[PDB]
């Protein structure tokens, strides 16, 4: 009623796009630590009973193709859809291994009118990627075709997003931990709010470079959801 119906036969797909190595000509660095993310996400969403598909090092053409194909599957027996993007990015943009693609192009395949078997079902996009280059220095009869999307961004509009080469990204580390701890106790927005607090309070950059040292991060929840989302 006030909650999405989550007792379809299947919870749904969880597509993880893990881009670590980029074509030399892009000038994009290797994203050390992202395999830790991809493995953590796979296990976390496995326990939430998602059908996880891990994909690694996809070109922008492969990303678009993958999303188009997945959006063309029959999702009638699935409660929801989750897509996780791990890559370089800028505001509104995610990197394939050979260059950028608009996030809007990826998510449009799942619009209420373009993926009918997901109409009315929660479509979750989890995005670990920069949204620009700002640093946070810290202190002290019809439904909309855009309805039932949630975008869980790792960082605020315009800002870098931080990834630790050993531990994985701040956001994915915190997201998986909070899901593991609270998916049986809390509605999704309140879980994501805990993720916000964890990232904001427990992480701070350490760099030999003064410009990049002692910096902070706040994730950014963007919800067009129309109901509460419970994983139990």
């Amino acid at each position: 009623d006030n909650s999405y119906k989550m007792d379809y036969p299947e919870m749904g797909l969880c597509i993880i796009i893990n881009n670590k190595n980029f074509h030399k000509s892009t000038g994009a660095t290797s994203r050390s630590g992202t395999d830790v993310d991809a493995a953590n996400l796979r296990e976390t969403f496995r326990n939430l009973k998602y059908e996880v598909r891990n994909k690694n090092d996809l070109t922008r053409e492969e990303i678009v193709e993958l999303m188009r194909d997945v959006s063309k599957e029959d999702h009638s027996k699935r409660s929801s859809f989750v897509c996780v993007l791990l890559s370089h990015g800028e505001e509104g943009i995610i990197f394939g291994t050979n260059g950028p693609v608009d996030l809007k192009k990826i998510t449009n395949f799942f619009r209420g009118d373009r993926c009918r078997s997901l109409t009315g079902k929660p479509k979750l996009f989890i995005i670990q990627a920069c949204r620009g280059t700002e640093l946070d220095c810290g202190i002290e009869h019809k439904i909309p075709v855009e309805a039932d999307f949630l975008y869980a961004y790792s960082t605020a509009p315009g800002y870098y997003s931080w990834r630790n080469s050993k531990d994985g990204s701040w956001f994915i580390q915190s997201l998986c931990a909070m899901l593991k701890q609270y998916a049986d106790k809390l509605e999704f927005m309140h879980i994501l709010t805990r993720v916000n607090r964890k990232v904001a309070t427990e992480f701070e950059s350490f760099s030999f470079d003064a410009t990049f040292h002692a910096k902070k991060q706040i994730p950014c929840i963007v919800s067009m959801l129309t109901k509460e989302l419970y994983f139990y």
Binding site: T29, W162, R163, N164, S165, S169
Partner: peptide, 4 residues
């Protein structure tokens, strides 16, 4: 720590 590195940025994406």
């Amino acid at each position: 720590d590195e940025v994406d």
